[PDB]
Write a protein that binds this ligand. Structure first.
Ligand code: FAD
Ligand code: F2L
Length: 279
């Protein structure tokens, strides 16, 4: 049973943070990609050569791209390849597949390594380009219980976080207690926050919190600071009567995943109540 494919057209490919783009694809009209929240597709690329200098990076992120000389990078692949990306839209957002794609630059200590293949290709895409996706696939799925849900996200982990949370509130009309905790470095790295604030106004059982590890003075930030595992503990789990009765859904960078899961285990949360997507 061959995997299904769709040739989609790029609607938009906008930065949402210094190093994350929202790639929004139009599904062919009259077609459906029958995915579940937390699920993903694979993208393919043809052979290509792309220059970071040709990327469309909005001006508020350019001084950091210039600082790290990122516009000098070039990426070339001579054979097609495939990679997985998680849906940021939820299943009732029809007609589109929306992705959050981190640019996978070379390691700081090995700066002359090749850039990441598929993320560099994706950042080269412009409105009207065509891309082939396949699947959908999934395993990062919500448990269907009445337990309280705690979503913890970082970086491009925002995509399955958004999909799950909108799926619970808008498709399932869930009455469960749900909260979302997102760690980012500074205010310009935060996105979709207006959507989550509106969901929290409309859904008394839902709350949303951002921690900034290194806010800039000009962020004028009076919110939580530091790492999200500490903020989640200090502002919520420390006087929760039974954190072990919560379901925790984690998708962030590895240093986040490790710190959150360690903090949860220290509280006595069982592995079966911790679901991780480690990209
Ligand atoms: C189920 C699943 C879902 C995912 N969902 C998402 C998502 O929603 N968003 C997202 O951004 N990603 C997601 N990922 C990750 C994604 O699939 C890719 O792994 C990611 O985009 C990086 O792939 P790439 O082709 O750009 O880089 P690759 O070509 O795989 O390279 C990876 C890294 O290795 C470095 N490298 C290469 N050669 C060398 C070398 N010689 N020395 C040192 N370093 C080297 C590259 O510079 C790059 O940093 C998901 C992964 C899975 C499995
Ligand atoms: C440990 C940790 O959470 N670090 C971190 C950060 F400080 C900013 C953004 C993402 C992160 F994972």
């Amino acid at each position: 049973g061959p995997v299904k494919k769709w040739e989609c057209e790029v609607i938009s490919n906008d930065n949402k943070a210094t190093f994350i783009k929202e790639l929004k694809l139009r599904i062919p009209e009259g077609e459906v990609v029958p995915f579940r929240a937390g699920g993903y597709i694979q993208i393919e690329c043809p052979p290509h050569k792309v220059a970071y200098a040709d990327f469309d990076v909005p001006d508020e992120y350019r001084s950091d791209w210039d600082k790290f000389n990122l516009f000098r990078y070039v990426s070339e692949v001579k054979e097609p390849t495939l990679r997985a990306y998680s849906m940021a839209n939820y299943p009732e957002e029809k007609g589109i597949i929306m992705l959050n794609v981190r640019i996978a630059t070379p390691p700081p200590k090995i700066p002359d390594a090749p850039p990441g293949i598929m993320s560099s290709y994706i950042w080269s895409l412009k409105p009207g380009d065509k891309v082939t996706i396949s699947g959908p696939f999934g395993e990062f799925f919500a448990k269907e219980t009445d337990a309280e849900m705690v979503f913890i996200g970082g970086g491009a982990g925002m995509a399955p976080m958004r999909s799950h949370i909108f799926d619970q509130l808008k498709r399932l009309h869930s009455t469960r207690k749900i909260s979302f905790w997102y760690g980012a470095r500074s205010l310009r790295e935060m996105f979709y926050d207006e959507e989550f604030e509106q969901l929290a106004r409309d859904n008394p059982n839902f709350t949303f919190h951002v921690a900034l590890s290194d806010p800039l003075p000009e962020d004028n930030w009076t919110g939580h600071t530091g790492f999200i595992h500490n903020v989640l503990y200090e502002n919520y789990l420390r006087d929760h009567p039974a954190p072990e009765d919560c379901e925790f859904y984690m998708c962030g960078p590895p240093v986040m995943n490790a710190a959150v899961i360690k903090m949860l285990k220290d509280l006595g949360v069982e592995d079966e109540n911790i679901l991780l997507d480690d990209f």
